Amino acid sequence: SMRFLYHPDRKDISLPGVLYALGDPARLEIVRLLASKGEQCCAEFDFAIAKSTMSNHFKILRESGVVLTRKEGTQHINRLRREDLETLFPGLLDAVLRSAQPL
Amino acid sequence: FLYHPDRKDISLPGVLYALGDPARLEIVRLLASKGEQCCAEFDFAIAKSTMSNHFKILRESGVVLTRKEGTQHINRLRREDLETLFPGLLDAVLRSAQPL
């Protein structure tokens, strides 16, 4: 494969949607890891979580506008939409990441 | 005061979850500018029990402190606690918050 999974346009990202997507210890930790380690394979996050719940987590991160997910080959690789979030919500990301605790 | 957690039990995912809703975010946005607000300043097209759950979520997550004065419920942003635990978060959020 060589394509990006569905992601909203900058136009359709809302502040409540982003906060909801960050509003979970697992998702917050995903974003924390994506912010510090760059792109990560979907399997990179082993949290002792039901795979259905982890799948829902990434889907929320994608649909909310936080995460850009790419499918290359068999696996899905995840990336923080840093420019989109900074342009829409200056200071939000750094404010959230400065306050997060390493899960 | 109504139910409210101790500062030790306020977490960031819980605060962000409480803010991650347009009605709840609107409540916080009003309380930040116009200060301690009683009463039905939060008149949205929402079920009464659902607006009540919104306030319960805001209280349980450590965002809002509510006290009863007469028949009225005076709500107050826990700015001190939130700034103490999560400096800059509230401003980062309010800077981009738009009226609903």
Automatic annotation (TrEMBL), chain B:
Disulfide bonds join 38-39. It comes from the Bacteria. This is Transcriptional regulator. It comes from Nostoc sp. (strain PCC 7120 / SAG 25.82 / UTEX 2576). The lineage of its organism: Bacteria, Bacillati, Cyanobacteriota, Cyanophyceae, Nostocales.
